[PDB]
Amino acid sequence: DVPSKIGTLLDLSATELEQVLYFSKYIVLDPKGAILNGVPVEKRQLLTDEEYRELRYGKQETYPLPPGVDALVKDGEEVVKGQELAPGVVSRLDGVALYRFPRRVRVEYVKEPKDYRVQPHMNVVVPEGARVEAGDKIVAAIDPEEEVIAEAEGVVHLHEPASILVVKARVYPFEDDVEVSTGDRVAPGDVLADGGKVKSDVYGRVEVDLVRNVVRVVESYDIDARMGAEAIQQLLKELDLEALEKELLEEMKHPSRARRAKARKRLEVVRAFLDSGNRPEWMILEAVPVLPPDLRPMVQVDGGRFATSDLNDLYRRLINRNNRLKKLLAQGAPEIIIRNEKRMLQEAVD
């Protein structure tokens, strides 16, 4: 209903309100010291999906190498933007480059460049440049008959990567048990492993790699940004109507006429909310009222056929979407599915 009352109170345009409500852009509630393109992120800032993903999970990219060719970069080496990874491909961001699926392992026995072939159903269980004693496993497989072991002592070298993963992160070697786990979030100065010998030097998401037995912290911020009507409800709950009224009164003395008109409209809305005793966050529904069924009847006509109103269909759609959203949340569904279901719930309420 133009002009939007929620947008008037929150100082969001109609386009911004629609984008936030229907899960098109995120809105920030706590930046947690997030820096976007060298510029600190501020509250009430709109983030697109890509910007939110970059700030929340970091930067990474996978380059698929052509079959047969061998990468010029080793596993666990730092690369810069524009550097050539394989003879035919070049990276686009600086970071640690990791072998995704090495197709061949070239172990060097001491008495001997014996090679072993890796297939899609086989996985490497040892890091690159590792000393392997006679008998230790090298490549694991579903069938033990094709499983690769070591004839004698040697050094395991990985070659022929299927693809290179370049991730902007920090790698920390460790020797003892790690104090953190995969998926946790760390800050500078937090302990990682070895009883404080290794500590995080930058924000990010922490993951432990037992194959390479190192701790990788992907550079990302624990930014608080949300979409939909829950973020708008949070903004309206955090609103201080007294302070907003005082600021609007102070801005009402601006020489510009358009500024005074905008201040007057916003202040009229604020005065209405203050005098009425209503709360702004009441404009977002947490419980949807249900009309009495006699006003939305399902009657039987003289012929035995049933006649029902469209409100029953709208209520049924709303209930189906709400129950399915509850089930999806209980199942830990991914963010895309949950976002789609929340958007459908909003559209059904509308």
Partner 1 sequence: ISTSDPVRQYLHEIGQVPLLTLEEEVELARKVEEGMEAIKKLSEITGLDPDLIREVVRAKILGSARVLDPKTVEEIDQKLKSLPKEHKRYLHIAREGEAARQHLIEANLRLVVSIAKKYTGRGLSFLDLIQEGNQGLIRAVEKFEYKRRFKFSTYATWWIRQAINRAIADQARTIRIPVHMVETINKLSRTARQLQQELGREPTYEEIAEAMGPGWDAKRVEETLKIAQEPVSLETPIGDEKDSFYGDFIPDEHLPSPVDAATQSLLSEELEKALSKLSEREAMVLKLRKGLIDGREHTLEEVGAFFGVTRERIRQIENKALRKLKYHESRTRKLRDFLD
Residues within the interface to partner 1 (CB under 8 A): 18-19, 22, 24, 49, 62, 64, 100-101, 120-121, 123, 142, 162, 176-185, 207-208, 210, 222, 224, 226, 297-299, 301, 304-310, 312-313, 316, 320-321, 324, 327-329, 331-337, 339-341, 343-344, 347
State the Cα–Cα distance between residues 4 and 266, nearest whole angstrom. 11
**Should residue 2 be labelled a site residue for DNA when binding is judged by CB under 7 A?**
yes
- Of 145 and 306, nearer to partner 1 (C-beta) is 306
State the Cα–Cα distance between residues 226 and 136, nearest whole angstrom. 49
Interacting partner of 265 out of partner 1, DNA, none (Cβ under 5 to 8 A depending on kind): DNA
Q: What are phi and psi of 335, to 5 degrees?
A: -65, -30
> And the tokens for 334?
């991914």
- Of 210 and 258, nearer to DNA (C-beta) is 258
Residue span binding DNA (CB under 7 A) among the ranges 7-15, 73-81, 91-99, 114-122: 7-15
Interacting partner of 313 out of DNA, partner 1, none (Cβ under 5 to 8 A depending on kind): partner 1
Q: Who's near 74: CB < 8 A, 6+ residues apart?
A: 128
Q: Looking at beta carbons, which pairs linking 78-85 to residues 24 or more positions away fall under 8 Å? A: 79/166, 85/164, 85/166
Residue 211, classed as helix, strand or coil, is coil
Residue 17, classed as helix, strand or coil, is helix
- Of 100 and 260, nearer to partner 1 (C-beta) is 100
As measured in angstroms, the least distance from the Cβ of 306 to partner 1 is 4
Q: Which parts of 298-327 interact with DNA (CB under 7 A)? A: 301, 305, 307
State the Cα–Cα distance between residues 341 and 274, nearest whole angstrom. 35
> And the tokens for 131?
């000393």
> Site residues (CB under 7 A) for DNA?
1-3, 13-15, 258, 265, 301, 305, 307
